Amino acid sequence: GGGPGELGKPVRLPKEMSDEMKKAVDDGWTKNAFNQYVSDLISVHRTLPDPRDAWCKDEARYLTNLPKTDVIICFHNEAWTVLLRTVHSVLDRSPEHLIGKIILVDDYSDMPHLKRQLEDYFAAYPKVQIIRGQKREGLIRARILGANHAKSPVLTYLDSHCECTEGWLEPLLDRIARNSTTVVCPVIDVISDETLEYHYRDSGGVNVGGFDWNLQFSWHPVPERERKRHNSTAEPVYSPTMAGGLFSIDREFFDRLGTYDSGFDIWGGENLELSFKTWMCGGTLEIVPCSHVGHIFRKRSPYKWRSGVNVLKKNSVRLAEVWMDEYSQYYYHRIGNDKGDWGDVSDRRKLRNDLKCKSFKWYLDNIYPELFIPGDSVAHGEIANVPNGMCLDAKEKSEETPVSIYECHGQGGNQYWMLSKAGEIRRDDSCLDYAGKDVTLFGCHGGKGNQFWTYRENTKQLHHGTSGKCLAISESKDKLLMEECSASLSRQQWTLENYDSSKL
Ligand SMILES: *[C@@H]1O[C@H](CO)[C@@H](O)[C@H](O)[C@H]1NC(C)=O
């Protein structure tokens, strides 16, 4: 008798709703970018299925005396039932002796339900502590504020729209108990933004964290190298990076690593900073398949991924400048080597030096050898039509986007391409494709075919394998097309920045 959404089952509203209900549902989406109305129907003690593999219950054995953790949850104008459901999932599914304090860090909310109402509600839970930021500061500063209030040996960071699952905590703390330089993440499961349905997979499908050369986090499957280290896919696996929202760390080790770079602005990337310094300054980073936490997955694209201005640049530049050695150049190519103002980084350099950290080359060689380095490609940079000043140009959404041509601007971004050994014209994981209609950009599949191109050096033509046609610019200079190949047609002549035959 768990009510709507019990055992993580979906809650669906009726097709027909009164106008007052419709206003309530729409209001919920406006405020939260998820369906707050259905969350409000679902118990804040909503039961969930046990998502763990049999290995996690029958074969995994954890140290008897685990260190206590504080759980730090930062929020800004979170919905009442969603914030409460997070906190109760922590209280109800974690052994009491393993929780120090649940520290709720209010990053300057203005909604009334988060003020006195929130204090009164948790007054009867002595483990819950509310910290009020004095101005709006963003996630990094709120998390550091939380860490400074924390007294337990381990910090566990969650966000405000999570649901812990059965047995989530012990596997994380066991790794830190064995070696306090180990940083750990639960497997992050999907809670639907529409129905709040909870979804879990077995440990066979575990993904691990990487990054692309735009310095954005990305997921990849456990590489074969790492799978060969384990007898069961349920064992914790090394991860080059963490997504950042959910992890545990020894409190002193976090401070030793310099927590987060407080010179970052609010637009993220501190997950990558912490990942890099964990591996190259004496620690390890694991994803722990026996530990699941559900997380409300908003399908709506957040502002930072579609901004008209590059809000990601400052933190990416500070990251590259402090931690990436000579490899920073590949990110700088992506932004046209226009680094902007990234502030003062000298204290972070002193931090890295004082910790005697390893090189970024060591990190790439040893932790993330699967990452392809753009300098090893046949060509990288702009792809320019010789007789004029038009460049191959595309908005890269990870969907099929149209590929066109625009005046070369020398700023990277939409005009940055790589020519791979396999004949792909690509940016990150999207490949130039032609199937007889329009030239498009979609996910690289590694099968050549319609994604196979050759640069014909003596004519400077971009020749397409399966069609036998050549990439060209219309004589009105405003449309990209595929046409019959012809030597001497200047409209079919392209130059590829950094083209190097020796690389194929
Ligand atoms: C803990 O892990 C770090 C990083 O792998 C390693 O340098 C250290 O020797 C380990 N400590 C113990 C006691 O195994």
Residue numbers in the entry: 143 to 540, 542 to 647
Give verbatim excerpts from the published study on this entry:
CG30463 is predicted to encode a ppGalNAcT/PGANT, which is an O-glycosyltransferase responsible for the post-translational addition of the sugar N-acetylgalactosamine (GalNAc) to proteins, a modification typically found on mucins and other secreted and membrane-bound proteins. ppGalNAcTs are type II membrane proteins that belong to the CAZy family GT2731. Interestingly, we found two distinct Drosophila cDNA clones emanating from the CG30463 gene, differing only in a ~30 amino acid region (the α subunit) of the lectin domain. Comparison of these clones to genomic sequence data revealed that they represent splice variants of exon 8. This splicing event generates an α subunit with a net positive charge (isoform A, containing exon 8A) or a net negative charge (isoform B, containing exon 8B). PGANT9A and PGANT9B adopt the canonical ppGalNAcT tertiary structure where a ~10 amino acid flexible linker connects the N-terminal catalytic domain to the C-terminal lectin domain.
PGANT9B crystallizes with 2 molecules per asymmetric unit, but density for UDP, Mn2+, or a peptide is not present in the active site under these crystallization conditions. The active site residue Asp 301 is misaligned, and the active site loop is disordered. The variable loop in PGANT9B adopts a similar conformation as the loop in PGANT9A, except that negatively charged residues Glu 538, Glu 541, Glu 542, and Glu 543 are clustered at the region of the loop near the active site to form a negatively charged patch. Another charged region is evident in the electrostatic potential map, where residues including Asp 535 and Glu 550 form a distinct negatively charged patch on the surface of the lectin domain. Thus, both enzymes have two distinct charged patches in their lectin domain formed by the α-subunit that results in preferences to recruit either negatively (PGANT9A) or positively (PGANT9B) charged substrates to the active site for catalysis. In PGANT9A and PGANT9B, the loop is closer to the active site than in the other ppGalNAcTs. In agreement with what was seen in cell culture, in vitro enzyme assays revealed that both PGANT9A and PGANT9B are capable of glycosylating the neutral T-rich peptide derived from the T-rich region (PPTQQSTTQPPCTTS), but only PGANT9B was able to efficiently glycosylate the positively charged PTTTK peptide derived from the PTTTK repetitive region (PTTTKPTTTKPTTTK).
